C-alpha cells in the first residue's frame, strides 16, 4: 500500500493480488538504510552496499516485512565484518525469509523470530555448529550454511558439528553444507529432510547408519568428495592413494523416495548394483568425472533403474589411453524411461553403428550427448534409426567427411539444477549439432539418409567451399541451417537453392571471402529461397556486391551488422542505394556497426515499404537527416544509440507519423528543439540517456504527450540544476512517468555546491 | 667523394673500394628534387614522393650517376601521371640501371643513354610494344615490363606486341612479362635470353616454334595461364571448359640449358614424358596448383629427371574427393639428386609406412613437406628410416595420438625465387614440425624409435597435460622443444626432467593454467635441466608461483614478457624479490609488458650477478630509481622504451659504470639534468626520441663524451627553436655524431613562424 513514496532511491513494485510490496535497493552504494521506508512493504532488498552494521531501530517501525535480503554486504577492499546488535530481529513477527550471505559473520545471529522459515548464511566465517544457537531455529525449513570454508574463503579448520545438532529441527526440509570442509556427515539428521547438499566437501567415508532415518529424502548430493583432480583448474586435494569415496553396499537402504542422486567427481571405480536395490523411483543419476570407463562396458547396476530419466556419464576417460571405440554395455536397454544421456569425455577414435545398438530400443530417448570425444571416423548415416531423437550432439570432436561480487551475491534460487543451454535451433525439431568439427568440405553423399533433420549446426568447422546448389540435397526437410565461422564463397546465385523448406539461414563470420575485392558476391541468392524468414549475415565485412539488389518475397528479418555499408553507399555511387527495396515482406533491419559516417540522400526512399524495426547503433552518424523519415510509413522502433548525432529534429510529428520507440542512448546532444515533442501523440518510448543535454524547456515536453509515455530515460547526463529549470525540477518530482535511476544516476553538474545533487531531491525555495 | 654534405635530407653512404656513393631519399615527401646533390654520387634513390614531373635540368650536373630509382612516385589519391621531358636522360653517359615503376607512364620513355643495362617499367600503363621505341634499347640486358594490365591495374585491352619486337635486342638476358594480359608468346625472342617470365598471363596455347631459338634459356615461368580458379581469393578467369594449358610434346626441344621450370597453377591434367626428353639438366620443377592427382600415381615423366633438385606438387587435390591414402608412384625412386619434396594439398586420410617406400632410397633427400593434408592416422614410428632427413613437415593436418604502396615499391630484386621460411629450429638438426595438429595428450610410446630427433615443434596443438617427467622419454637427443599455444600444467617440478640434452625450451602462450590462482606453479623446474641455455615463457600471465626462486646453473637467456610481475612484486610482499637471483649464468632478461607501475626497492639486489641485457619496455614505469643500478656491475643494454618515466638520473656515471646502450624511446621526459652525461665515457649508444624534451644545455652534453657515441637519436620530439639553444643549434649542424632523421623527423615547435623548421637548416643571425 501507501502507493506514493517521497524520496526512496529504490524501485517499488505493488502486487494487490499477492499483497506484496517489493523494495529493491540493489547496487545503490547506500552507507545507511534510507529513511521514509514504507511500513506496508513485505520484501526488502539490501544487497551489495556499504552498510557498517545492523541496529534494532533499523526495522523498528517495519512489522509487515516477510523477506529481508542482505547478500554480499561486505565481500573480502571491505571494512571490518558486519556486527548485529542483540534483539535486532525479534520485532519482525511476520518475518519468514532472511538472507545474510557474504557478511563475514563469525557466529549464527541470535534473537531470530520463531516465524522464520528460510535462513541463508553462505560465504561467512561460521565453522562451528552447536545446538545452543540452533535451539531458536526450531521452526526453520530451509537452511543454507555452505561456502563457509573452502579454497575461495579459507578458514584452516575442519568443520565441527556437535552430536545431534540438527536432530531437533523437526520442520527442516532442505539442508546445504557445500564447500564447508566437512569431514563426517552430521548425524543424526532429522527424518523430515528432503534435499541434502553435502557436495564439495572432504568426506572420505560413509557409515551404514548415516542415512538410516532419512525416508522422505528426494535429492542427495555427494559430489567433490575425493574428487578427480587431474587437469583441475582450481585448487583441489585428491584423497590419499587416489582412494575412491568409500560407500557401503547397504548405504542407500532407508532411502525410498529418492529421485536425484549426484555422485559427480568422486573418483569412483565400481558401481555395485546393491546401491540401487531399494531406490526404485530414482529419476536423475549423475556419475560424471569418475573413473568408470571400465564400468560402462559392464554397467551391471543399470538393471535396477527402470524409471531413470537422466543419466550423466561425462568425462570418465582413462589417463594416457585412447580407446578405439565406445564400449556401451548391453544393459543400457533396460533404461525404458531414459530421456537424456550424456557420454561426453569418453574420448575414443571411431564410432560405429553397432556400438549404439543398446540405445535402439529406447522409445523415450530424446537427447544423446556425444560431444568432446575426439571422434575421428563417424558414419552419419547410422543416425537414420534415431528419428525419434530430438537433439543429437556431435560437438568439438574431430568428425571429418567420409573418405574413399561472488556467486552468493546473485541467484536467489541458491541450490538449483544445471539448466541446459537452450539453443535457438532446438525448437525447430531434430537437431544435429555438428559444430566445431573437422569437416572441411560438404558432400551430398555424407548427409544421405538424413531427410528427417529439421536443424543443422555447422558453426566453427572452417569450411572453404563454393556451393552451387547440390551439397545439401538430401536435407529436404531442413528448416534451420547454421554456417557461422566458416569460409563461404558466394560465387553463384544458386547457393542453398535445393533447401526448399529452409526458414532461417546464418552465414555470419564469413569475412574471409567477403573481404576480398573484385570477386563476384551474388547477394541475390535469397530469391530462390521461397519460405526464408530470417537471414543473419552479420560480421561479414561485406564491402562490394555484384548483384545490384537483394530479392526475397518472404524474408522478414535481416541482420546486416558489422559490415562495410559506407563503401557500398559511398558518395557518387548510387548503384546500391535500393539494395533492400525488393525485400517486400521485410519488417526488421539491423544495419549497425557499419562505420556509416553519414546517410546519403535516397537510401530512405530505397528502404522496404513494410519496414518496422530499424537499428543504426554504434555507427558514428555525424549528421542524420530527419525529414526523410516521412518515406517510411511503418517505422516504429528507430534506434540510433551509441552514435555521434548532435541535433534532434525540429518537429517529430512532421518527421514520422508512427514512430513510438525512439532511442538515442549514449549520444552527444547538448540541447533539444523548442517543439521536439509537439503533437507527437503516437510516441510511447523515448530515450535520451548518456547525453550532454543541459536543460529541458516546458514548450518542448508537453504533459499531454508525456502522460501516455510508458518509459523515459534521462540518466547519466550533464543536466545543470540552476534556477532556469524550475519547471523541469517541479515536473520531474510530480509526474508518474516511469523514469529509472531517478535518484541514483541522474545528478546535477552545478552550480558550485550542487555537484552530485539528486534532481528529485531538489527544492529551490529561493527560486 | 665530397664527404661533407650541407643540407641533404637523404642518407649518404661511401664505399671507397667500390667507388660508389649512395643517396637514399626513401619516404621523405619531397615535392621536388633537393638542391646541393653531390656530383660524385652513383646511386640515386627517389622512391615514393610527390614529384610532379622530370626535367632535363634535374640531372644536368650529375654525370657520374649509374643508378636512378623512381619506384612508386605516383600510386593510383595521386595527381596526373608523371611527364618526362624529351632528352631528360641523354646526359647520363655512365647510367647503367634505371627504375621507373609505379609512374603511370603511357609509353616507353625515349632518349635513354646507350649505356643502359637495366630498365624497369612495372606498374605502368604501357600495353603496346613496337620496335621503334625499342630500337634505342639495343644495349639493354634486363627488361621488366610486367604488371601493366591485370586485376589490380586494369587496362581492358589485351597486350599487343608487334612481330620481332625483341629480336634485335642482342644483349637481352632477362625478360619479364608477368600480369600483362598477354595472349600469345611474343615471337621471336632473342637467342641470348636466359630468364623468361611469362606467368600470370592469358596465354592459352603454345606453338611448337615458340622456343625454337632459345638455347641458353635457364629459367622459364608459365604460371597463371589457364589457372586453377577454385577457391581463389583473387579475381581470376578460368579458361573455357576448364581446358588446360595446351603445350605440345615437342615444345621444350631447343631448351638444353634449362634449369628452372615453373608450371604452377596451369590446370594441367597429364604430364607427358616427351616434354623432359631434351632437358636433362633440369634442377627445379614446379607443378603445384594443378589437377595432377591421378598423374602422381603414375608419374611416368619422373624417369627423365635424374638431376632434379626441387620438386613441388602442392595443392593438387580433387574436388569433392577425400583419398584414403597417398598414392606415390614407384617412379619416385629415379630422383637420385632430389633434395626438397613438397606434397602439400594432397589431402588424404591415412599415411602408412609402405606409402613412403619410393622415397626410402633417396640419399640426398633433406626436406619432406607434408603439411596441410588433413592426415588423420599417422604412425610416427615410420619415420625411423628417414634419419638422413633434415626437416619433416607434419603441419596443420589432423594427426592425433595413436589409439588402442605496392609490390614494386619495394624488393629491388624483382624476380626472385620463393625464399623458404627459415625457422629457428632448423639449425639444430633433424626437425619434426608437428605444429597445429590434433594431438591432445603425449605418450612415451608414440615418440618411440625417434631418438635421432634434435628438434620438435608442438605449437598450437592445445595439449592439456600435467607432465611429471616421463612423456618425452625416448627423445634422448632432443635439443629444441616448442610448446607454445598449449595448456601446460606445472604442478610438478620434475617436468622435462628426462630431456637431458635440451637447450631451448619454449612454453609461451600457456596462459590457461597460469591464470588460475591457488594452484601450484613449480617455477624451479629448470634446476634439473643441466644444459638449458634459453627459456622463453612469455605471454603466460604468470601471477603467482609456489617456488620462491628459480634455479638454473646454465640458463643464459630468459624471456618473461607479457606476464604479471606487479602482483609478484606487490608492495609488502618480499617473497619473490630474489626470483632471478639463483640464475648464476643468466645474461639477458626480457621482463617487459608486465604492467610494472614501479620497481620495489630490493629487486636490483636480487638480480643475477652476470646480467648484461635488461629490458623493461612497455611497462609503464611511473618512477624508476637510478641509484640502485650500481648493484648491477655488468649491465650494458638497459632498455626503458615506451615507458612513462619523467626524470633522468642526476649523474649517469654515478649510477652505472658499464652502461653503454641506454634506450628511452617513446618516453615522457621534459628536461635533462645539468650533469646527465658527466664523465660517462663508457657509453656508446643513447636514445631520447619521441619525448617531450624542450632544450639541451652545453654542460649536460660534453663533446668529449659525444665524440665516442656511435649513434644518438633526438627525433620526433618537442624541441623549441628559440634563442636560448644557440649552442645546441651550432653543435647539431657541426658534429659527426650519427643522428638519423636529422632533417625529416626532428622539427621545431616554435616560436611562431618557426613551426616545422629543420634544426639542421637553422641559422639565427639575430641571436
Ligand atoms: C517476497 O518474499 C516472499 C517470501 O518472503 C517470496 O515468496 C516465496 O516465493 C517462492 C517462489 O518464488 C516460493 O517458493 C515456492 O516453492 C515451492 C516448492 O517448489 C520447489 O521446487 C521448485 C522446482 O519444482 C523450485 O523451483 C522451488 O524453488 C522450490 O525449491 C513451489 O511449489 C511454490 O510454487 C513456490 O515456487 C516461496 O514458498 C515463497 N515464500 C513464502 C514464505 O511464501 C516472494 O517470491 C518474494 N518476492 C520477490 C519479488 O522477491
Ligand atoms: C648501386 O647501383 C649499382 C648499379 O648501378 C649496383 O650494382 C649492382 O649490384 C648487383 C648486386 O647487388 C649486381 O648484380 C649481380 O648479379 C650477378 C648475377 O647473379 C644473378 O643471380 C643471383 C642468384 O645466384 C641473383 O641474386 C642476382 O640478382 C642475379 O640475378 C652476380 O653474379 C653479381 O655478383 C651481382 O650480384 C649488378 O650487376 C650490379 N650492377 C652493375 C651495373 O654492376 C649496386 O648494387 C647499387 N648499390 C646500392 C647500395 O643500391
Ligand atoms: C580444511 O580443514 C583441514 C583440516 O585438517 C585444513 O588442513 C589444515 O590446514 C592448516 C593450514 O594450512 C594446517 O596448518 C599448518 O600446520 C603446519 C605444521 O604442521 C604449519 O607449518 C603451517 O604453516 C600451517 O599452520 C594444518 O596442518 C592442516 N591440517 C592437517 C591435518 O593437515 C585445511 O586447511 C582446511 N581447508 C581450508 C580451505 O581451510
Ligand atoms: C551452433 O554451435 C555453436 C557452438 O557450439 C554455438 O555457438 C555458441 O553459442 C553459445 C550460446 O549462444 C555461446 O555462448 C555464449 O557465449 C557468450 C560469449 O561469446 C556469452 O557472453 C554468453 O553468455 C553465452 O555463454 C557460445 O559463445 C557460442 N560459441 C561460439 C564459438 O560462437 C551456436 O549458438 C550454435 N547454433 C545454434 C543455432 O544452436
Ligand atoms: C585483358 O584483355 C581482355 C581482352 O579481351 C579484356 O577483355 C575485355 O574486357 C573489356 C572490359 O570489360 C570488354 O569490354 C566490354 O564490352 C561489353 C560489350 O561486349 C560492354 O558491355 C562492357 O561494358 C565492356 O566495355 C571486352 O569485351 C573484353 N574482351 C572480350 C574479348 O571479351 C580484359 O578486360 C583484360 N583484362 C584486364 C584486367 O584489363
Ligand atoms: C612451430 O610452428 C609454428 C606454426 O607452424 C610456428 O609459428 C609461426 O611462426 C612464423 C614464423 O615466425 C610466424 O610467421 C610470422 O607471423 C607474424 C604475424 O604473427 C608476421 O608478422 C611475420 O612476418 C611472420 O610471417 C607465424 O605467425 C607463426 N604462427 C603462429 C600460429 O604463431 C613456430 O615458429 C614454429 N616454431 C619453431 C621453433 O620453428
Ligand atoms: C567391453 O567391456 C566389457 C566389460 O568390461 C568387456 O568384457 C570383459 O572383458 C574382459 C577382457 O577380455 C574379460 O576379462 C571380462 O571377463 C569381460 N567381462 C564381461 C562381463 O564380458 C569387453 O571385453 C569390452 N569390449 C571391448 C571391445 O572393449
Ligand atoms: C554409412 O552407412 C551407409 C548405410 O549403412 C552406407 O551406405 C551404403 O552405401 C553402399 C554404396 O553406396 C551401398 O551399396 C549400400 O547399400 C549402402 N547401405 C545401405 C544400408 O543402403 C555408407 O556406405 C556408409 N558410409 C561409409 C563411408 O562406409
Ligand atoms: C554444381 O557443382 C557440382 C560439382 O562440380 C557439379 O557436378 C559436376 O558437374 C559436371 C558437369 O556436369 C560433371 O562433369 C561432374 O561429374 C559433376 N560432379 C559430380 C561429383 O557429380 C554440378 O553439375 C553443378 N551444378 C550446377 C547446376 O552448376
Ligand atoms: C543475381 O544477379 C546477377 C547479376 O548481378 C545475375 O547474373 C546474371 O544472370 C543473367 C541471366 O543468366 C546473365 O545474362 C548475366 O550475364 C548475369 N550477370 C552476371 C554479372 O553474372 C544472376 O542471374 C542473379 N540471380 C538471381 C537468382 O536473380
Ligand atoms: C595409384 O595410381 C596408379 C596410377 O594411376 C593406379 O594404377 C592404375 O589403376 C587404374 C584403376 O585400377 C587402372 O585402370 C590403371 O591401368 C592403373 N595403371 C597402372 C600404371 O597401374 C593405382 O591403382 C593407384 N592405386 C591406388 C591404391 O589408388
Ligand atoms: C607403429 O610402427 C611400429 C613399428 O613398425 C609399431 O611397433 C610395434 O609394436 C608392437 C607392440 O608394441 C611390437 O610387437 C612390434 O615389434 C613393434 N614393431 C617393431 C618393428 O618393432 C607400432 O605398434 C606402430 N603403431 C601402431 C599404433 O600400430
Ligand atoms: C621446487 O620448490 C618446491 C617448493 O616450492 C619444492 O617442493 C618441496 O620439496 C620438498 C622436498 O621433497 C618437500 O619437503 C616440500 O614439502 C615441498 N614443498 C612443496 C610446497 O611442495 C620442490 O622440491 C622444488 N623442486 C626442485 C627441483 O628444487
Ligand atoms: C522491434 O524490436 C524490438 C527489439 O527489442 C522489439 O522489442 C519490438 O517488439 C520490435 N517491434 C516489432 C513490431 O517487431
Ligand atoms: C510541419 O508541420 C506543420 C503543421 O502540421 C505543417 O504545416 C508544415 O507543412 C510541416 N512542415 C514540414 C516540412 O513537414
Ligand atoms: C643485448 O641485446 C641487444 C638486442 O638487440 C643486442 O644487440 C646486444 O648484442 C646484446 N648484448 C649482449 C652483450 O648480448
Ligand atoms: C657522485 O659522484 C661523485 C664524483 O665521483 C662522488 O664524489 C659522489 O660520492 C657520488 N655520489 C653518489 C651518490 O654516488
- Cβ-based contacts under 8 A for chains A and B: 83
The C-alpha atoms of residue B540 and residue B538 are separated, in whole angstroms, by 5
Indicate the residue of A232, A404, A466 with minimum beta-carbon distance to B323. Answer: A404
The C-alpha atoms of residue A86 and residue A55 are separated, in whole angstroms, by 8
Cis peptide before A9 (omega within 30 of 0): no
Q: What are phi and psi of A335, to 5 degrees?
A: -80, 75
CATH of the domain at B668: 3.80.10.10
Cβ within 8 Å, pair A466-B231:
yes
Q: Which domain holds residue A284?
A: 1-767
Burial class (CB in 10 A: 0-12, 13-18, 19+), B187: middle
The C-alpha atoms of residue A75 and residue A81 are separated, in whole angstroms, by 9
The C-alpha atoms of residue A193 and residue A175 are separated, in whole angstroms, by 8
| Nearest CA-CA distance, residue B467 and chain A, Å | 11
Gaps after which residues in chain B, C–N over 2.5 Å?
76, 404
Q: What are phi and psi of A482, to 5 degrees?
A: -110, 125
C-alpha cell recorded at residue B177: 612479362
A658 lines ligand 8 (CB under 6 A): no
Side-by-side strand order, sheet with A348-351: A323-325, A348-351, A377-378
- Residue closest to A124 by CA, chosen among A410, A408, A405: A408
Q: Taking the CA of residue A609 as centre, how many other CA atoms within 13 Å lie in the half-sphere pointing to its CB?
A: 4
| Nearest CA-CA distance, residue A228 and chain B, Å | 14
The C-alpha atoms of residue B385 and residue B24 are separated, in whole angstroms, by 53
Among positive and negative, which fits the CA dihedral A206, A209, A210, A212?
Answer: positive
Does B763 show up as a binding residue in the annotation? Answer: yes
Q: Which residues contact A757 (CB under 8 A, 6 or more apart)?
A: A721, A747, A748
The C-alpha atoms of residue A273 and residue A277 are separated, in whole angstroms, by 7
Q: Is the CB of residue A301 less than 8 Å from the CB of residue A279?
A: no
The C-alpha atoms of residue A640 and residue B415 are separated, in whole angstroms, by 53
Sort out which chain A residues have CB atoms less than 8 A from B513's CB and list them: 233
Q: How many A from CA of A482 to the centre of ligand 10?
A: 26
Which residue CA neighbors atom 5 of ligand 13 most closely? Answer: B547
Q: Is the CB of residue B759 less than 8 Å from the CB of residue B719?
A: yes
Does B639 show up as a binding residue in the annotation? Answer: no
The C-alpha atoms of residue B520 and residue B517 are separated, in whole angstroms, by 8
Bridge-based pairing state of the strands A391-393 and A377-378: unpaired
**Which among B238, B349, B517 is the top mutation candidate for probing chain A, defined by the most A β-carbons within 10 Å of its own β-carbon?**
B349
The C-alpha atoms of residue A692 and residue A714 are separated, in whole angstroms, by 11
CA A455 to ligand 4: nearest atom: 38
Indicate the residue of A232, A322, A464 with minimum beta-carbon distance to B403. Answer: A322
**DSSP states along A709-740:** -SEEE--SS----STT-HHHHHHHTT-----T
The C-alpha atoms of residue B714 and residue B728 are separated, in whole angstroms, by 12
Cβ within 8 Å, pair A403-B324:
yes
C-alpha cell recorded at residue B237: 578467369
Q: What are phi and psi of B293, to 5 degrees?
A: -65, -45
Cβ within 8 Å, pair A404-B512:
no
Residues with CB under 6 A from ligand 4: A 423-425, 433, 435-436, 457, 459-460, 482
**DSSP states along A114-170:** TT--EEE--SS---EE-STTTGGGTT--EEE--SSSSSSS--SS--EE-TTSSTT-T
The C-alpha atoms of residue B415 and residue B405 are separated, in whole angstroms, by 18
Cβ within 8 Å, pair B374-A400:
yes
- State which H helix or E strand residue B729 sits in: helix B726-732
Q: How many domains does chain B have?
A: 1
- State which H helix or E strand residue A196 sits in: strand A195-197
Which residue CA neighbors atom 28 of ligand 2 most closely? Answer: B413
- State which H helix or E strand residue B705 sits in: helix B703-707
The C-alpha atoms of residue A324 and residue A374 are separated, in whole angstroms, by 11
The C-alpha atoms of residue A42 and residue A18 are separated, in whole angstroms, by 10
Total residue count of chain B as it appears in this document: 767
The C-alpha atoms of residue A596 and residue B639 are separated, in whole angstroms, by 43
Q: Is the CB of residue A568 less than 8 Å from the CB of residue A576?
A: yes
Task: Provide the H-helix boundaries in A499-648.
Answer: 511-515, 565-568
Q: What are phi and psi of A276, to 5 degrees?
A: -95, 25
Amino acid at each position: 500500500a501507501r502507493w506514493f513514496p517521497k524520496t526512496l532511491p529504490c524501485d517499488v513494485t505493488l502486487d494487490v493480488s499477492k499483497n506484496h510490496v517489493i523494495v529493491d535497493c540493489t547496487d545503490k552504494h547506500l552507507t545507511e538504510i534510507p529513511g521514509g521506508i514504507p511500513t506496508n512493504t513485505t520484501n526488502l532488498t539490501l544487497t551489495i552496499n556499504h552498510i557498517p552494521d545492523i541496529s534494532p531501530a533499523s526495522f523498528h517501525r517495519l512489522v509487515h516485512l516477510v523477506e529481508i535480503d542482505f547478500r554480499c554486504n561486505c565481500v573480502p577492499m571491505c571494512p571490518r565484518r558486519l556486527q548485529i546488535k542483540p534483539r535486532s530481529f525479534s520485532g519482525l513477527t511476520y518475518l519468514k525469509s532472511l538472507y545474510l550471505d557474504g557478511n563475514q559473520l563469525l557466529e549464527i545471529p541470535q534473537g531470530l523470530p520463531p516465524s522464520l522459515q528460510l535462513l541463508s548464511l553462505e560465504a561467512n566465517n561460521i565453522f562451528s555448529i552447536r545446538k545452543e544457537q540452533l535451539t531458536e531455529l526450531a521452526n526453520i525449513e530451509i537452511l543454507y550454511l555452505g561456502q563457509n570454508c573452502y579454497y575461495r574463503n579459507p578458514c584452516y579448520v575442519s568443520y565441527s558439528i556437535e552430536k545431534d545438532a540438527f536432530l531437533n529441527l523437526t520442520k527442516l526440509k532442505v539442508l546445504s553444507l557445500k564447500d564447508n570442509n566437512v569431514t563426517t556427515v552430521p548425524t543424526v539428521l532429522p527424518s523430515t529432510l528432503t534435499e541434502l547438499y553435502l557436495y564439495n566437501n572432504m568426506i572420505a567415508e560413509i557409515q551404514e547408519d548415516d542415512f538410516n532415518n532419512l525416508n522422505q529424502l528426494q535429492i542427495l548430493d555427494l559430489s567433490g568428495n575425493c574428487p578427480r583432480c587431474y587437469n583441475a583448474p582450481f585448487p583441489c586435494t585428491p584423497c590419499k592413494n587416489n582412494s575412491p569415496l568409500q560407500i557401503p553396499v547397504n548405504a542407500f537402504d532407508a532411502l525410498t523416495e529418492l529421485k536425484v542422486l549426484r555422485l559427480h567427481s568422486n573418483s569412483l571405480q565400481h558401481v555395485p548394483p546393491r546401491w540401487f536395490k531399494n531406490i526404485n523411483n530414482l529419476q536423475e543419476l549423475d556419475l560424471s568425472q569418475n573413473f568408470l570407463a571400465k564400468e560402462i562396458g559392464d554397467a551391471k547396476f543399470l538393471h535396477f533403474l527402470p524409471n531413470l530419466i537422466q543419466l550423466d556419464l561425462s568425462f570418465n576417460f582413462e589417463l594416457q589411453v585412447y580407446r578405439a571405440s565406445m564400449n556401451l554395455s548391453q544393459a543400457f536397454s533396460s533404461l525404458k524411461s531414459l530421456k537424456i544421456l550424456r557420454i561426453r569425455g569418453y574420448v575414443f577414435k571411431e564410432l560405429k553403428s553397432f556400438q549404439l545398438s543398446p540405445l535402439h530400443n529406447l522409445q523415450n530417448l530424446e537427447v544423446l550427448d556425444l560431444g568432446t570425444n575426439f571422434i575421428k571416423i563417424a558414419n552419419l548415416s547410422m543416425f537414420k534409426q534415431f528419428k525419434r531423437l530430438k537433439v543429437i550432439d556431435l560437438s568439438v570432436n574431430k568428425i571429418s567427411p567420409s573418405g574413399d561480487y561472488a556467486r552468493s551475491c546473485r541467484f536467489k534460487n541458491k541450490e538449483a539444477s544445471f539448466t541446459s543451454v537452450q539453443e535457438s535451433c532446438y525448437k525447430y525439431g531434430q537437431t544435429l549439432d555438428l559444430s566445431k568439427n573437422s569437416i572441411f568440405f560438404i558432400k551430398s553423399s555424407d548427409f544421405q539418409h538424413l531427410s528427417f533433420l529439421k536443424c543443422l549446426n555447422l558453426s566453427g568447422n572452417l569450411i572453404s567451399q563454393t556451393l552451387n546448389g547440390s551439397e545439401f540435397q538430401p536435407l529436404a526437410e531442413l528448416r534451420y541451417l547454421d554456417f557461422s565461422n566458416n569460409r563461404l564463397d558466394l560465387l553463384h546465385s544458386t547457393a542453398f537453392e535445393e533447401l526448399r523448406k529452409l526458414e532461417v539461414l546464418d552465414i555470419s563470420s564469413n569475412s574471409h571471402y567477403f573481404q576480398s575485392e573484385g570477386i563476384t558476391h551474388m547477394l541475390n541468392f535469397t530469391k530462390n529461397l521461397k519460405v526464408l524468414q530470417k537471414l543473419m549475415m552479420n560480421d561479414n565485412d561485406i564491402s562490394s556486391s555484384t548483384s545490384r539488389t537483394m530479392e526475397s518475397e518472404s524474408l522478414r528479418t535481416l541482420e546486416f551488422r558489422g559490415n562495410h555499408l559506407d563503401v557500398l553507399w559511398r558518395d557518387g555511387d548510387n548503384r546500391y542505394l535500393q539494395l533492400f527495396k525488393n525485400l517486400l515482406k521485410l519488417e526488421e533491419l539491423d544495419i549497425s556497426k557499419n562505420s556509416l559516417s553519414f546517410l546519403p540522400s535516397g537510401v530512405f526512399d530505397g528502404m522496404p515499404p513494410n519496414l518496422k524495426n530499424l537499428s543504426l547503433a554504434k555507427n558514428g552518424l555525424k549528421s542524420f537527416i530527419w525529414e526523410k523519415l516521412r518515406y517510411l510509413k511503418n517505422l516504429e522502433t528507430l534506434d540510433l544509440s551509441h552514435n555521434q548525432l548532435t541535433t534532434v529534429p525540429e518537429r517529430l510529428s512532421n518527421c514520422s507519423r508512427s514512430l513510438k520507440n525512439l532511442i538515442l542512448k549514449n549520444n552527444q546532444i547538448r540541447s533539444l528543439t523548442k517543439y521536439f515533442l509537439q503533437d507527437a501523440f503516437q510516441l510511447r518510448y523515448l530515450d535520451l540517456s548518456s547525453n550532454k543535454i543541459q536543460m529541458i524547456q516546458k514548450t518542448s515536453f508537453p504533459e499531454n504527450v508525456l502522460n501516455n509515455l510508458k518509459m523515459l530515460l534521462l540518466h547519466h547526463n550533464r543536466f545543470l540544476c540552476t534556477c532556469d529549470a524550475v519547471w523541469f525540477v517541479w515536473w520531474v518530482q510530480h509526474t508518474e512517468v516511469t523514469i529509472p535511476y531517478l535518484a541514483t544516476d541522474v545528478t546535477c553538474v552545478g552550480p558550485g555546491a550542487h555537484k552530485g545533487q539528486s534532481v528529485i531531491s531538489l527544492d529551490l525555495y529561493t527560486c
